[PDB]
Design a protein around this ligand. Structure first.
Ligand code: FMN
Ligand code: FMN
Ligand code: FE
Ligand code: FE
Lengths: 208, 208
């Protein structure tokens, strides 16, 4: 049977510097993301979910209180892998690819999209995520926020871009200054090539 | 009219060392707790809640979606003040005062209480709090966990002890090792004198 794996970061541990440090990537990927993988494999071992894909596990556990631990760990594995691929060395700034025109259509301009995405990331209370999503591949774009592990697949939406706003994502480099982390993400980290692939339902990134 | 204030810590910024550092107390109290105070005062200014006590504001906003920002900030002001007073230099260990016998009655022993309190603190997913509570002053003890800003007053319960398990409470000193923070809290930080006062409905601590 297949097993859930911790994918490698799609870049080196100094490649997001000085925006996100080596130390953050070490704790965030090598400890937090790893723990979600380990916990999920332990929870599904010897059950009817062993050997299913990560997305099958999320779909099988969403909305089921008796499977909250499975959902929380599986959705967090998926969200972190999505997040790492949403960043890149020399990323950030205005959109490239097909998403540029689609962002202008949905939001009016890149700057309006960035304002709305930053507001979602800023106002998510507690732990969670902010997302650019589509209703379907190549479809209508919108912004949503989620709490804790919740994720666009659990709402039938297609994730396109995400930022993790759990405190561990930014506390080492920014302490309480979540807005500065969010601005840094938009200005200097966003990977539009991955976002475009996800919007177009294409394969991309390091996801296993 | 009265205003909501940031109470001083009830000890010096090195007084919890090495268990909780000066740096954590600076960010956690001087930045996070302060921000909840500032936000709450801004939200109630010029409204019918200005000049009410902190507990009146929580009671007026609980369960009202249109007042979620007021509730989240007011409950977090209260929770942090409660939390600081739940710690002390040379604290920790088995209970003193009336609570010792009440803990034996409710949980069987101090060690069983500590196990259950640590489990609540460990399994709270995302941001939140773990609590020893009573159903009324001098009443029946139990443990509960809350998510984000939620707090025993919003459930008609009397808070007796709390630990903050938002990541900012421990990330500077423990990084991802929340269990080590929880053990450190029980072994070395708990202030039973404050907990006893709260259980007995008496006045105590630095709360303004
Ligand atoms: C955005 C995204 C993130 C994923 N993250 C992981 C992951 O962290 N661990 C894992 O085992 N599978 C993860 N997967 C699933 C695998 O990439 C892969 O789709 C699955 O193992 C099925 O294999 P196949 O695509 O070669 O048929 C992820 C998939 C997607 C779309
Ligand atoms: C546990 C606890 C925490 C509190 N924290 C604060 C606080 O951080 N800021 C504040 O303005 N009032 C806080 N209060 C309310 C004040 O301590 C006080 O009760 C209120 O201002 C009413 O004043 P009085 O007790 O002198 O009549 C807190 C009260 C309690 C019980
Ligand atoms: Fe994270
Ligand atoms: Fe806190």
């Amino acid at each position: 049977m297949t097993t859930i794996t911790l994918p490698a970061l799609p870049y080196g541990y100094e490649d997001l510097a000085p925006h996100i440090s080596k130390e953050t990537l070490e704790y965030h990927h090598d400890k937090h993301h790893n723990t979600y993988v380990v916990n999920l494999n332990n929870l599904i071992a010897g059950t009817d979910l062993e050997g299913k894909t990560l997305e099958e596990i999320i779909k099988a556990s969403v909305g089921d209180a008796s499977k909250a631990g499975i959902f929380n760990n599986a959705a967090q594995v998926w969200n972190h892998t999505f997040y790492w691929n949403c960043m890149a060395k020399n990323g950030g700034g205005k959109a490239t690819g097909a998403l540029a025109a689609k962002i202008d259509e949905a939001f009016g301009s890149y700057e309006k999209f960035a304002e709305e995405f930053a507001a979602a990331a800023t106002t998510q209370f507690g732990s969670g995520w902010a997302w650019l999503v589509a209703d379907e591949v190549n479809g209508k774009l919108s912004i949503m926020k989620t709490s804790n592990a919740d994720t666009p697949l659990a709402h039938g939406k297609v994730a396109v871009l995400t930022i993790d706003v759990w405190e561990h994502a930014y506390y080492i480099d920014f302490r309480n200054a979540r807005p500065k982390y969010i601005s840094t993400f938009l200005e200097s980290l966003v990977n539009w090539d991955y976002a475009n692939a996800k919007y177009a339902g294409q394969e991309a990134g390091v996801e296993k």
